Design a protein around this nucleic acid. Structure first.
Ligand SMILES: [K+]
Ligand SMILES: [Mg+2]
Ligand SMILES: [Mg+2]
Ligand SMILES: [Mg+2]
Ligand SMILES: [Mg+2]
Ligand SMILES: [Mg+2]
Ligand SMILES: [Mg+2]
Ligand SMILES: [Mg+2]
Lengths: 119, 80, 176, 48, 136
RNA sequence: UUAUUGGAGGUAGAGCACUGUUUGGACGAGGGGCCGUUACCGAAUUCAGACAAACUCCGAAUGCCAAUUAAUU
RNA sequence: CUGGGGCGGUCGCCUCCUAAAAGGUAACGGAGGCGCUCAAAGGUUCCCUCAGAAUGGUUGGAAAUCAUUCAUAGAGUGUAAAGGCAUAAGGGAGCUUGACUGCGAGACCUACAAGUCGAGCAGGGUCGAAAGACGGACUUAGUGAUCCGGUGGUUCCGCAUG
RNA sequence: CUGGUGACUAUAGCAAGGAGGUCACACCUGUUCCCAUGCCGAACACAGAAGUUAAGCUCCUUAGCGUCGAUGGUAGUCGAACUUACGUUCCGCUAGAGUAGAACGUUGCCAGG
RNA sequence: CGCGGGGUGGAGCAGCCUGGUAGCUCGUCGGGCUCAUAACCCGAAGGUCGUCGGUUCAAAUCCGGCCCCCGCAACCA
RNA sequence: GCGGGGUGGAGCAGCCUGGUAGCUCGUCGGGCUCAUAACCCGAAGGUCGUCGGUUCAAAUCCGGCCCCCGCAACCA
RNA sequence: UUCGGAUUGUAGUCUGCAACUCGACUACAUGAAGCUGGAAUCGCUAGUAAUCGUAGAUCAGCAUGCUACGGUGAAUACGUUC
RNA sequence: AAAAAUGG
């Protein structure tokens, strides 16, 4: 009876290790990424206050559509970049959430960069 | 699978020749002879002396009767 | 994928009816097959391990991982890190092909075959079969076999109990 | 490491660094990129 | 002759002897016990002498427990040597006993036999003692 | 110097969670003399009871360092 | 030096205990290490988690290699001990050479000479998508003043001047 | 209420029993593509939506383990007095163990319901 | 530090001078010998020449680097 | 007090430098002799003084207990 | 090893009253050591050695022993110091 | 012209 690992738990161990060294400030807030089997979520968090400033998900009505997960990640990155710009945020630090920086995570990050967030 | 490390591997028909019983599966044997499958494409055939449908243990077939007891051998030998 | 189709169609239904599973996700399946060969004489002659690796690769279809000593043991004259085994993990279609081949073409080639041990279950639904000679497998020609050596085949299943594992393997067609 | 080693820039020849090496492990003249202050750039230095 | 099969350090600072008994102040295995009322080192030789005395009086009828154990090695210098030049060699083994500790316990005999046996035992020891029973 | 407040630290005591030391029970994973059952049970487990400068799950009194700190000096 | 001297032992450096919960603190008090090692056993990025036990399995046994489960650290951390490290400081892999140059607010230690830590700035780099990290190694031993001489460099001097 | 992401010495954990699924989280279906395995599409990565609450996950119950934990008393001890007694007395401080008991978390922000 | 020499079958010595070819005495194996034994005689196996390079059709031999041993001599941080 | 040593039945190597127990004599078996000795062929025989430690591994390296040898034990 | 045929299983034949201790022989099957033998040691000078079979006594049965028979059929002897 | 002891 071989056990099956909980991918989210493994991810969270990795994420806590990343977050020891990576934290978001009011002037340079942290762009956190959460990834599921279907959707991708992004927040911009000031860890000094522990408050979110902007959010964007592939599950949101504005972004939900019929596209590949990577395309949805691109759209989520663009949306979060736009909302951050509207709230007056340019510098951020990218928290890959413990996921490998690749594929959907990388597409979201590059979309935010292109939309104008300065890492 | 990685490229170039694994041996050549392809579908073959294992043919138990005793019962002329065919079944398709993968293997690296690469036997030359080709016999048509139910599907149109042929694949190389591997001659098999024995198989699951030809082994006495699998089939339950008893090749030879059990050894006679001592009383029975006594009686049959001496006619009594 | 003949064996996989059999599992999907007949074995699933038989096993679920027998064990009263409220959902199909409870139906045991063969998670993986690990074929291991411990070559301790590789300490004295590495060519033995090389031949063993080649034979295991021919049997399984994929390159084996060479396993090295985890610790040094004086009596065996074994130093930590010395390669003393080979291992192949099979999953999916290759696993099913190897399993049906082992049940049908290979096992009957065992000399004086009388079935496989019915008690060789770890106690948690996994079955280990010890083959005593490689010549069993149809892919090996006895001419090229410098030495005859065995293998351990570990069928790792999702069954929680030896009873369910036995039912699964029997339905697949394992002699006992 | 068991012997002293001087690394000299292979472009200007200046003996810019000292280090150490094990002669049995690295019998050859070891080479590596190091900053050459005279040239204000990284150059290949090698054991003299 | 009791002594540890081994110790980490053979040369040890001698134990503190002021204060009261830290533990083992109650009869816990037998019915009767011998309770120390003064402080002393107790040597393995003294333990053995007292044990033999009490068991011989009890004539194997009852059971005896030694509650103390000589864990501590003490050293002594070789004869007629001057001060200094390192610490001396292990001479013996001692248990530190302070008021209240139960040294021995006995069971399986009458109170009178236990009293006489523990009297004989106490006369072998360098501490004052008193006969004690299980409390309730 | 005292009062108040904060802090560093592992001593006295205590304890046995670790490393060692140690006393009585219970039981024995398993094999031997034993047919199944009357050694060793060396293992492990478990109950109770003890020991420690170089043991610590704990842990004082003091002393110490400070404070946009008050009183006396 | 020395519980008189000789003889024996010792002499510098690191760790622990004695040491009395800051720091310091002696004895020919109780215990051990050092006079190195590593071209990766360094930097960086990503990934990973042990020892041990039980149960199955061939050569294979109490221990080799394989599989499941339990196992919170009993493993490992180059090397003594102590303090730390399982968000690893432990393990694997890729790329690399910061085991840089000029320095240095400030601080520890301290009779002196020395010794220790150090943000940050400039130059030029490595790894990383980036944030960022990197001026050797989990930390603390692995060392020896001046004089003199050797070797390399040098927009320094050059006994009338060159 | 659900999820994401923080804070707090486990009073938060473990274990056992029970409930849940169109949203969502998973398991799950595959390996064409980016990417990957010292062997393995197991994992990582990607594409996807036939099936399932079986497991994870979430929620509910509890006090068996772990965690927390008084009051009172005791040990120790600053100071003083008397004393050489393995000490006494007075005052202040005051454990550890144990006992009663607490506890199957409490909360900030954001997006959905 | 300078100058010389030495390193060759299991042991002890040539062959290096002057390029080819690995010789000699012991030791082991087989045979002759003898009533055996020794001695003696004959067949074999035994180092590729301290190690790595270099010049040559050709290296134990010639030329360099390196590892040890010996003789004499040098040495005022 | 300081050194050195302890290994088949005896004597002596092996330790320095961990993975490998050697030689001579003695013992036993077969042979040769009328028999013994000598001699020839073949074999057995040491858990490396005894306890702990480091090591994957100890005759070997490190520390105790024992036994033997040598040197030292001086000034009044 | 298509050498060798020991050992073992099964099935039989014969003599004898009766083949377990404890006979010979046959069939099927199995298929051990053994690759020319250390020190040492023996026989033989011609129809000899070596090799191949044949017969007889004892005897119900039982021979690789003993005693006889023939077939093929060598090498060598310088010589007498040891 | 090598050496080859002893035997109540
Ligand atoms: K007394
Ligand atoms: Mg104490
Ligand atoms: Mg004096
Ligand atoms: Mg202190
Ligand atoms: Mg001077
Ligand atoms: Mg001039
Ligand atoms: Mg004789
Ligand atoms: Mg006579």
């Amino acid at each position: 009876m071989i056990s099956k690992i909980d991918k989210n738990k493994v991810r969270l161990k990795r994420h806590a290790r990343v977050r020891t060294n990576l934290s978001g400030t009011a002037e340079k807030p942290r762009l956190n990424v959460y990834r599921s089997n279907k959707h991708i979520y992004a927040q911009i968090i000031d860890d000094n206050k522990g408050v979110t400033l902007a959010q964007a998900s592939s599950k949101d009505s504005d972004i939900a559509t019929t596209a590949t997960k990577v395309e949805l990640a691109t759209k989520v990155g663009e949306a979060i970049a736009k909302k951050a710009a509207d709230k007056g945020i340019k510098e951020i630090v990218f928290d890959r959430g413990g996921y490998l920086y690749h594929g959907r995570v990388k597409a979201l990050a590059e979309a935010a960069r292109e939309s104008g967030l300065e890492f | 699978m990685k490229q170039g490390i694994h041996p050549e591997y392809h579908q073959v028909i294992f043919l138990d020749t005793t019962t002329n019983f065919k079944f398709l599966s993968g293997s690296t044997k690469t036997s030359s002879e080709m016999m048509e499958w139910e599907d149109g494409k042929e694949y190389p055939v591997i001659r098999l002396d024995i198989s699951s449908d030809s082994h006495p243990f699998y089939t339950g077939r008893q090749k030879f009767a059990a050894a006679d007891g001592r009383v029975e051998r006594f009686n049959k030998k001496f006619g009594l | 994928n003949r064996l996989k189709e059999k599992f999907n169609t007949e074995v699933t239904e038989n096993l679920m009816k027998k064990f009263n599973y409220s959902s199909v996700m409870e139906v045991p399946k063969i998670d993986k097959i690990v074929v291991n060969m411990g070559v301790g004489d590789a300490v004295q002659n590495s060519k033995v391990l090389d031949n063993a690796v080649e034979e295991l690769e021919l049997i399984t279809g994929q390159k084996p991982l060479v396993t090295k000593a985890k610790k040094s043991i004086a009596t065996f004259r074994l130093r930590e890190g010395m390669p003393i085994g080979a291992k192949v993990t099979l999953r999916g279609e290759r696993m099913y092909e190897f399993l049906d081949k082992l049940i049908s073409v290979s096992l009957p080639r065992v000399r004086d075959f009388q079935g496989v041990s019915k008690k060789a279950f770890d106690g948690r639904g996994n079955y280990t079969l010890g083959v005593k000679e490689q010549l069993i497998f149809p892919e090996i020609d006895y001419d090229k076999v410098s030495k005859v050596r065995g293998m351990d085949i570990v069928i790792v299943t999702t069954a929680n109990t030896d009873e369910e594992a036995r039912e699964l393997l029997a339905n697949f067609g394992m002699p006992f | 490491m068991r012997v002293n080693v001087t690394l000299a820039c292979t472009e200007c020849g200046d003996r810019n660094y000292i280090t150490t090496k094990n002669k049995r492990n690295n019998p050859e003249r070891i080479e590596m990129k190091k900053y050459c202050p005279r040239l204000n750039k990284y150059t290949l230095h090698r054991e003299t | 002759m009791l002594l540890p099969k081994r110790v980490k350090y053979r040369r040890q600072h001698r134990p503190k002897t002021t204060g009261r008994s830290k533990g083992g102040n109650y009869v816990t295995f037998g019915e009767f016990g011998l309770q120390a009322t003064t402080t002393s080192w107790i040597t393995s030789r003294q333990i053995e002498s007292a044990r033999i005395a009490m068991t011989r009086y009890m004539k194997r009828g009852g059971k005896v427990w030694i509650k103390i154990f000589p864990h501590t090695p003490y050293t002594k210098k070789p004869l007629e040597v001057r001060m200094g030049a390192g610490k001396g060699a292990v001479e013996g083994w001692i248990a530190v006993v302070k008021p209240g500790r139960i040294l021995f316990e006995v069971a399986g005999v009458s109170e009178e036999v236990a009293r006489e046996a523990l009297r004989l035992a106490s006369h072998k020891l360098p501490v004052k003692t008193k006969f004690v029973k299980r409390e309730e």
